[PDB]
A paper describes a structure:
Among class C GPCRs, GPR158 is unique as it lacks a Venus flytrap-fold ligand-binding domain and terminates Gαi/o protein signaling through the RGS7-Gβ5 heterodimer. GPR158 dimerizes through Per-Arnt-Sim-fold extracellular and transmembrane (TM) domains connected by an epidermal growth factor-like linker.
Since the 2GPR158–RGS7–Gβ5 and 2GPR158–2RGS7–2Gβ5 complexes exhibit virtually identical structures, except for an additional RGS7–Gβ5 heterodimer in the latter, we focus on describing the overall structure of the 2GPR158-2RGS7-2Gβ5 complex and close-up view of the 2GPR158–RGS7–Gβ5 complex. In both complexes, structures of GPR158 and the four domains of RGS7 DEP (Dishevelled, Egl10, Pleckstrin), DHEX (DEP helical extension), GGL linker, and the RGS domain, and the Gβ5 subunit were clearly visible and their models fitted well into the cryo-EM maps. However, most of the cytoplasmic domain of GPR158 (residues 669 to 863) is disordered except for a coiled-coil (Ha and Hb) comprising 61 residues. The second RGS7–Gβ5 dimer is oriented in pseudo-twofold symmetry with respect to the first dimer against the Ha helical axes. Similar to the first dimer, binding of the second RGS7–Gβ5 complex is achieved through helix Xα3′ from the DHEX′ domain. Thus, although the interaction between the second RGS7 and Hb helix is not as extensive as the interaction of the first RGS7, the RGS7′-micelle interaction contributes to the stability of the second RGS7–Gβ5 in the GPR158–RGS7 complex. The ICL2, ICL3, TM3, and first helix of the cytoplasmic coiled-coil provide a platform for the DHEX domain of one RGS7 and the second helix recruits another RGS7.
Numbering used by the authors:
A (entry chain C): 18 to 218, 256 to 450
B (entry chain A): 703 to 763
C (entry chain D): 15 to 353
Write the structure that this text describes.
Amino acid sequence: SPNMLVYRKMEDVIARMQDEKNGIPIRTVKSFLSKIPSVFSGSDIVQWLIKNLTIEDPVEALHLGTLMAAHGYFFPISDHVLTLKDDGTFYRFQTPYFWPSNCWEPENTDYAVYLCKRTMQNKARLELADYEAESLARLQRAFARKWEFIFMQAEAQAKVDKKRDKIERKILDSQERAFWDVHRPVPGCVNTTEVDIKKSSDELQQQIKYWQIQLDRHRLKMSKVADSLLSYTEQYLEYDPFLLPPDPSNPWLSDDTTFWELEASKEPSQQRVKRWGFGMDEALKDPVGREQFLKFLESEFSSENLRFWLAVEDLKKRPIKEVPSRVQEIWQEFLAPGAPSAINLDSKSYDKTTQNVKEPGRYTFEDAQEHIYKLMKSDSYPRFIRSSAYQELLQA
Amino acid sequence: AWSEHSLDPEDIRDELKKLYAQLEIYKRKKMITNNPHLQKKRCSKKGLGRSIMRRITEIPE
Amino acid sequence: LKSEAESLKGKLEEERAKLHDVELHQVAERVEALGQFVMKTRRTLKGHGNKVLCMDWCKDKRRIVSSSQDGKVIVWDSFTTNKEHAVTMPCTWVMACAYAPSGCAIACGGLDNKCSVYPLTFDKNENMAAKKKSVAMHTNYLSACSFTNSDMQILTASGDGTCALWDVESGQLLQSFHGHGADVLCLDLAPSETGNTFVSGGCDKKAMVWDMRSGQCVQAFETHESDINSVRYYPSGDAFASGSDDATCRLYDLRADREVAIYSKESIIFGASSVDFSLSGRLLFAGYNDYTINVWDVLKGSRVSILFGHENRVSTLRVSPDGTAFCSGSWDHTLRVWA
């Protein structure tokens, strides 16, 4: 179960927190009104975080502390809503029987028990806040039968704990107050219990063959990948609109629209034209690049292979209703010998084509597309980038 | 003491004594809680006794 | 035979030593480090009435799609904050939405086992849900979709441990993948239009990548410490990293077949609930469970900011494709547009 590991890590945290030799010291304050022992101030825990965790931002360490304290690992002695506030207020750890890691789950009758007990310990005031008084009103109206032993065991517990010493009753009642704060919190702050429903739950011959495919699994050195990754970063590094953008026009930040609108304009910017020059794949991604490359191929009387590859791609878009209607037709137009558009195949290519053409398939012309595609990538794109039209358009 | 062994056994025995005291008071209330029906009182008493013996045998384990 | 198998493994170790002679960041320290960022809020959305649990950009680079857990899908304009659509799903826990390339339809579903798709346009002013046409349907809750660039074929993933491609009008299944045994949660297209492949990993602590031309589980990896909760391709089409509820994000190559560098920090402890790259392929994004976001350098491995905006947990996160900003999914019942 996932969150179990999370709670385990934070358990590591608090275990290092109340360390014998290091740790925060749980002090005993003396006041003009009273003498309160076994507390400490939130500035202490803030300092402890910053020391032993090296959390550079005070705010960041404070937010870590915030959610920790909203998972019941320490609470403010005079408040319902768990929030760590860096100041002189008094805190306390929680008990190993009342962590939240212990799969606990209170229920409505037990909330009634704690309500009767708190309301009946003191009888000097309605020692409570308006939300908890509201909850008790509902519990009354709906629990008409079962009240009595609730009251019974409540005052029984009151005697069984008051019989022990006066500071004991105080600390135990403080703890077993806060632990019900965290498991039924004030209307505002988020519950920290819930979870998402998603987590709501020959033999050696194939073995040996896996070993052999790992052998023939061609790999390259990490330095090679390093160069590839750095270089693919660099070639658009000057295009990153987060890090260093030359067009400062930011429709988000600087309330402009012109950047995208220039992007909509079919006329390519000089960035655009320099960016075409990296790879014809990116070109074909560009509609503008498709148009200009196709123009050159036409004016050079060489506008077929691109026509084919566009044909393959535009075929790979329609549903299964038209796959046969196109495959036979595209064969008869390009891959049927005797048609004007003469795609050119070798032995195994045309063999594969002839065998598959009976059956229209989502991966029909894979090897032929590879063949013509390596052809175009090897020949066309180079001369295009080398071409006068490319140079004249990249100049301005 | 703000502790783990001590406070662990402390809260544990606290809940334990609370349970056992609740049980004794239940034994007395058998006839004292004459306010409602017998079998209903019977069912409540039975459920309480069962859960209490369960919690006891678990505290013993 | 066992000895020979382990010796081939040792030979893989030897070739890995030769290939990784110097570490990724052991060479990466060479590139000049990076400077200060000042990103903070630039918008806010105030329409939902629950948590929000999915979001996607269009290709028009300005709209917004996001579905909720209470039956109500939305279509904003963060540039304008003015609703132009609305729609209600019959069910609860709508756990995945997707946007059409051109802007024609959106697929929302999960926990009802059937992934409906609605025609996005301003076609019928009566309802955005009334034209509900069942297209896919598994027998379990449905994790996500990737209209895989044709606008007539959508992926889906459920607790079945098996994904497939489902046509638009027909409901006619097109191929299947049954290499798994748990709940898969991840799915993303490749950036390349070379081989329309994709990845699926999941509760099994592993990740595996399908080749849609066959349906055969070619690559497969496992290093995570728990369930995984999303993944994304390195936007050059060459690798992909991720993070999960280990809080320990990692990045993986395709060509070397090896982990590249650890992404973790003891400070953050909570779960990792999304990732997505920046158009440079320089940064790294990830929404977390400790309510922050966390941009990390992809090379030098340091943090660069933590931009505290969300009163609750981060659900899922994306980069706009233009490359100009990013949004967050979060447990605070609203969205922001983080620039």
